[model samples]
Target: KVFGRCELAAAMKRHGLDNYRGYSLGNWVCAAKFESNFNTQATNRNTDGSTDYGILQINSRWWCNDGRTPGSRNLCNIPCSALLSSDITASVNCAKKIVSDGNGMNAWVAWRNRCKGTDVQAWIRGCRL
Candidate 1:
């Protein structure tokens, strides 16, 4: 499932991602845009065989348990498939855990490239809160 800009914001806000870890909804939106373009089914396969899964691209190496990862920590304790659900409950929860774990939004490499170091207000521009 792919979400439009405001659609994504509304969904994320429902899970308290707005202002989460002091990062604005725009910040989250911007990161999502770069990370997975708000597509729940999005995925990326790393050269090492660890795949990044779902909207936030939760990694198989340290977060989700894909079972295929050689030595996955499965820190989030959820299957990587959970991140692919359009419901996004597990995805949001896992993302919250990722932020609350002291890394803040910096855990996503995509965040650093665009969503970090700024308000990111433009990402949500005219979108209703």
Candidate 2:
């Protein structure tokens, strides 16, 4: 389901996204805003021909296998289509795996450009975890 800002914050915090990998949960909220605008069915294809799927825009090249992106490693070992579900369970879990790479949230360029080193708490104003 689509989520409002505060609602998404509460949901993510419940999932232990808070302080995950030393990044604030607001980083997740902010990244999702620019990556997909909180839409579960979002997808964006890059110039190199890899497509990013779902709300956090997990890429097909290395994460999920889209059956289309050449050289796909499918490290997540799931179909790219699975990330599009409204439940967001797949998205959240996959996102955690992305951050677990030791790069933290910098795995998402959108987060780097739009959220990194910013007052990310502003993204969750009036929202309590």
Candidate 3:
């Protein structure tokens, strides 16, 4: 389940980050930091019937109501449990794909631009690998 850097890059490619907002690594890292405190295994089942899971804090119910089992439609069929497994890189990459595929960079840009009140474009450059 461990995703190497190349695998993560490939996953990003599959998710279309290259086409969406130039795949701003800085923004993606900043967004991930702000979202889940950089914990790829983070999962929050909130009282408001909302949940945040994985590095991106993807809503568990939104991603997979089944709770990490296989065959889930969220995260490209990689189950919720997979996000919390020991192989954190997979989870990180999965969450990256989720954000990149689900809402694209605009959604993250909005989070950074509107909510964070910071320039996401600039943040992306800071996260260059």
Candidate 4:
């Protein structure tokens, strides 16, 4: 499901994403925008036959299983469909584990290409939180 920017921000804050893994909430918000436009069910097929999952666009190769993608590491130990829920608990938990691996936000190409070094204040603008 697609979420409004403020809605997403509020949810992220509620789930402890404001300062997750040393990355600002704006960083994650912006990355979510670029990655999947806050759509939890978003999925993208890669050239290598793998897929990206959920709001963070986590790769199937290293993260979750899409059934078609073989040799999945399934590091999060959760089904790929778990990331596509409106609840977001599993997705956020998996994201935490990913960032805890020392990748920071650099694991997301969207963060690197857009959010990185860009002033992120606007990402949270007008949010009461």
Candidate 5:
């Protein structure tokens, strides 16, 4: 149930996210480590006690409104925790497309520039595909 470094690396590579925009798998690993310790099953609750669940830390209430069935609520189509176990590839693919605008390299650039440091605005200025 746990995805180790090599497995994660392999997944990223298989998805064509390895070494994108000069942001190597190592860089992503580092970021994930700091953000979620690369945990594929981590979850959190907001101040209002609402649950945000899953490895990528997706918000359950927002994304899992339909429960675990095929069609329940469209807002959160799937349970966040369920996403950790099921449809990981889809999650990664969706995230990549959203963040990169269909360019994996651009996503990498954004990850490196905007997410690398504490200064988000400064880092975003450095992003380029």
Candidate 6:
């Protein structure tokens, strides 16, 4: 599923991530935009042979199992395919777990490189929430 910026913001807010784990909603929105353009079905094969899954691009190496990858920690206990769904409930829950596990937004290269110190407010521009 593809979402406009504002639509993505609203959905992230509804998922209780407006200000989750000390990261602003804009942080999440910015990371998602750079990671996958808010496309739920987004997937990318990394140079290390692991695939990134879903809007936030959780990796198959550690976060979820893509089945094709062996030795996946599957820390989120979810199929990588689950992250590709439009609902995003499972993805959100898994993301929260990842953040709480000490990676924070740094778990995503996009967040570290693009959103860490940037003016992320623009990501939520014109959104009521």
Please give each candidate's TM-score: 0.94, 0.94, 0.54, 0.95, 0.54, 0.95
For model 4, what is the error of residue 84's alpha carbon versus the real structure, in angstroms, after optimal superposition? 0.8
Q: Write the per-residue lDDT of candidate 5 for residues 67-107, one digit (tens) a residue.
A: 43333333534445565663456456535544454444333
**lDDT winner, 2 or 6:** 6
CA deviation > 4 Å runs, candidate 2: none
Give the local distance difference test score of model 3. Answer: 0.53
Candidate 3: stretches off by over 4 Å: 1-21, 48-50, 65-75, 86-89, 96-102, 106-117, 120-128
Candidate 5 residues lying further than 4 Å off, grouped into runs, are 19-23, 48-50, 60-78, 101-129
Per-residue alpha-carbon lDDT of candidate 4 for residues 39-73, written as tens digits (9 for 90 to 100): 99999999989989898888889888778887768
What lDDT tens digits, residue by residue, belong to model 1 across residues 10-108? Answer: 888988998888887888889888999889999999999999999899999999888889976998899999899999889989888899998788899
RMSD of each: 1.1, 1.1, 6.0, 1.0, 8.0, 1.0
Task: Report the alpha-carbon TM-score of model 6 versus the true structure.
Answer: 0.95
Candidate 3 lDDT tens digits, 1-129: 333334444444455454344555445545655666555567777675656666666655446454543343553455566666545555555555655565665544335564354565554342233
Prediction 6 global C-alpha lDDT: 0.90
Against the reference, the lDDT scores of all candidates come to 0.89, 0.88, 0.53, 0.89, 0.50, 0.90
Error of 3 at 49 (Å): 2.8
Q: In candidate 6, which residue pairs get closer than 3 Å at backbone N, Cα or C atoms, i.e. clash?
A: none
Q: In candidate 4, how many Å is residue 128 off?
A: 1.2
